[PDB]
From a paper:
B. bacteriovorus is an obligate bacterial predator of other Gram-negative bacteria, exploiting adaptations that allow consumption from inside the prey cell periplasm. The DgcB protein appends the C-terminal GGDEF enzymatic domain with an N-terminal forkhead-associated (FHA) domain, known to be used (in other proteins) for interactions with phosphopeptide ligands. DgcB comprised a ~30aa tail, 100aa FHA, 20aa linker and 160aa GGDEF domain. We provide the molecular basis for initiation of c-di-GMP production, demonstrating that the stimulus is a phosphopeptide tail present on the DgcB GGDEF synthase itself.
Distance constraints guided the assignment of FHA domains to their respective GGDEF partners, revealing a unique conformation for each chain. This arrangement is best described as a pseudosymmetrical GGDEF dimer, appended to two FHA domains that are asymmetrically orientated; the net effect is to place the FHA domains closer to GGDEF chain B. The dimer is stabilized by two molecules of c-di-GMP (classically intercalating via their planar bases), bound at the I-site of both monomers. The bound c-di-GMP arises from co-purification, as a result of (basally) active DgcB. The bound c-di-GMP dimer at the DgcB I-site is orientated in line with the two-fold axis of the GGDEF dimer, complexed by R218 and D221 of the conserved RxxD motif. The interactions of DgcB with the c-di-GMP ligand provide the major contact between the two GGDEF domains; direct protein:protein contacts are limited to just one weak interaction involving the partially ordered linker region. A putative N-terminal tail preceding the FHA domain (residues 1–31) is present on our construct but presumed disordered in this structure. Examination of the pocket reveals that the putative phosphate site is occupied by a bound ion in chain B, and that of chain A is partially occluded by residue D56. The vast majority of contacts to the GGDEF dimer are made by the chain A FHA domain; these comprises both polar (D70 and K48 to chain B) and non-polar (I40 and I126 to chain A, Y45 and Y68 to chain B) interactions. The conformation we observe likely represents a feedback-inhibited state wherein the GGDEF domain has been locked by the c-di-GMP product into a non-productive conformation; we posit that this represents a form present after entry of prey. Hence, most GGDEF proteins do not adopt this orientation as it would lead to steric clashes of the appended sensory domains, but in DgcB this conformation is enabled by having the chain B FHA domain offset.
Residue numbers in the entry:
A (entry chain A): 32 to 134, 144 to 309
B (entry chain B): 32 to 134, 144 to 310
Write the structure that this text describes.
């Protein structure tokens, strides 16, 4: 069973895709002739190639603009770097893992990535921080809180508030955000949306779209209409931040500025 | 002062032209995106490229039909040759000299509208087909044109029609499609939108979003309202299709059905 590379980060549709490295002169590139064809402008048309010498697989940079980087080390043009199991190869904004031994429908593809927020927030946070750092790509976090949630629980019981939390999560994930966006509950009454690739301005606009849609949605629990609004806070990862909760903390401070300004609104910074 | 290649023989206008080899990823080819773009049919679209490792400059053949030949020796596909002063590099019928010391816009965007050009679309189409095939993912195409465009030009002048094309494309590009969705002018007042990974249902929704937004938008040309609508045709790549123009042809048939069905509508090819 031949060695392979698996896409860790790449354009939509590519993550989890495996390419067997069966021979020398297999090329990673954005040219259609590439055996490892990745439709991404950060790759050169012919970016890097493989050399196979029995069991030894090496990668060679082909004079790429955005470099070939193995485990964080730049490989100079035409130099050959011997690969071993679990090495990471970064070519532009695409990152592969090398497997000494390599391993389909609509549900199987969505399982592959954990689309529509299957994952855990405590896993996804660190993933987003690592991605932002390795790609030098903006990462924004939007936090939301239900206004007057204690009043909802007092008036309709804890099961009423539970219904609202569960229903709000359902609507956001299934109707309002992209399948590769990550949305989760965090603590008692808060929600976190991770937007890898989104700068502050964009994150604010997404947060506001969600705020207005939730405001307009009819929450009916056991035949009774519950008024629901949310307050919103937005932050974008800074260079000095190393834990995702640091981004959350600033987003949460923005949220409570939104709440102390009259609630049912969005604040950025 | 960087190394360069100088054209010794080539098409008229090229001889004596020097191309600095200032970094890696400089490609010789007949594709417009090539840094060393030579308009000669004997060159491959991407023929050869350079690799720079400090003061060492090498050339790499990219599987070219007519070969990359350095001082009479053929360089096999994907192999490199370290260059030295006065080496001659022959790529098809064009010959360069390498000099250890030597002495335009590639965006492919329409001047009026800022959409991608027809030439860009002609390159992007094969890429979209390859992506659909390797990912086993739907590919959809939406095509449209402005209804009664001749009447707009007659009534408001050619600058009025120009305003409409430019404004319509501003709305589409900046408000209605994703930044990685590919939108191009395809002759005249026809436009093509490529939707990677999008089934028919999605493509129809995008087509309708565009049609409805344009219908409702105020095209105000020197204080006066121009009524603007578009007719839309939509198709989705079928399993047996191998060229993007096959998908285009079916979308264009749907567009003509839109025109014959009253205009200002979307038709999804049945
Ligand atoms: N206002 C706004 N809402 C957004 C945006 N991005 C995502 N959403 C919302 O989030 C829903 C799901 O997004 P999706 O998973 O990417 O799933 C989408 C996506 O795969 C596709 N799609 C829709 N519009 C476009 C488009 O313009 N370009 C491309 N490439 N795909 C689109 O169709 C799916 C369903 O689309 P919708 O029914 O509209 O359902 C959208 C839409 O309600 C945005 O940029 N602006
Ligand atoms: N990760 C993430 N980002 C979001 C989302 N919603 C909005 N955005 C981001 O916010 C930008 C502007 O959103 P827009 O005003 O709705 O303006 C959008 C919208 O009018 C339209 N559109 C694009 N995708 C969709 C979609 O899935 N559904 C609908 N109904 N419209 C879409 O095309 C415009 C430009 O789209 P983009 O270039 O992608 O630019 C988007 C995109 O970067 C979201 O749910 N998830
Ligand atoms: Cl390139
Ligand atoms: Cl290249
Ligand atoms: Cl973390
Ligand atoms: Cl060619
Ligand atoms: Cl017409």
């Amino acid at each position: 069973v031949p060695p392979a590379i698996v896409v860790l980060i790449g354009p939509p549709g590519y993550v989890g895709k495996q390419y067997p490295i069966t021979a020398s002169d297999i090329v990673i590139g954005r040219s259609v002739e590439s055996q490892v064809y990745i439709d991404d402008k950060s790759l050169s048309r012919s970016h890097a190639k493989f050399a196979v010498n029995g069991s030894e697989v090496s990668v060679i940079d082909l004079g790429s603009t955005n470099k070939t980087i193995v485990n964080g080390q730049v490989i100079p043009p035409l130099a050959s770097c011997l690969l071993k199991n679990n090495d990471q190869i970064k070519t532009g904004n695409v990152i592969f893992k090398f497997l000494e031994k390599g391993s389909y429908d609509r549900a199987q593809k969505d399982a592959l990535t954990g689309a529509h927020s299957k994952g855990a927030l405590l896993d996804k946070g660190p993933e987003a921080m690592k991605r932002a750092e390795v790609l030098n790509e903006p990462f924004s976090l939007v936090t939301f809180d239900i206004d007057h949630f204690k009043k909802i629980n007092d008036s309709y019981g804890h099961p009423g508030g539970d219904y609202v939390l569960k229903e709000l999560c359902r609507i956001v994930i299934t109707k309002l955000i992209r399948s590769n966006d990550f949305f989760a509950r965090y603590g008692g009454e808060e929600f976190v949306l991770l937007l890898s690739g989104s700068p502050s301005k964009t994150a604010g606009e997404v947060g506001e779209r969600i705020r207005q849609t939730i405001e307009a949605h009819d929450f009916t629990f056991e035949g009774k209409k519950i008024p629901v609004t949310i307050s919103v806070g937005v932050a974008t990862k800074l260079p000095n931040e190393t834990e995702w909760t640091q981004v959350y903390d600033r987003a949460d401070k923005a949220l409570y500025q939104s709440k102390q300004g009259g609630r049912n609104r969005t604040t950025i910074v």
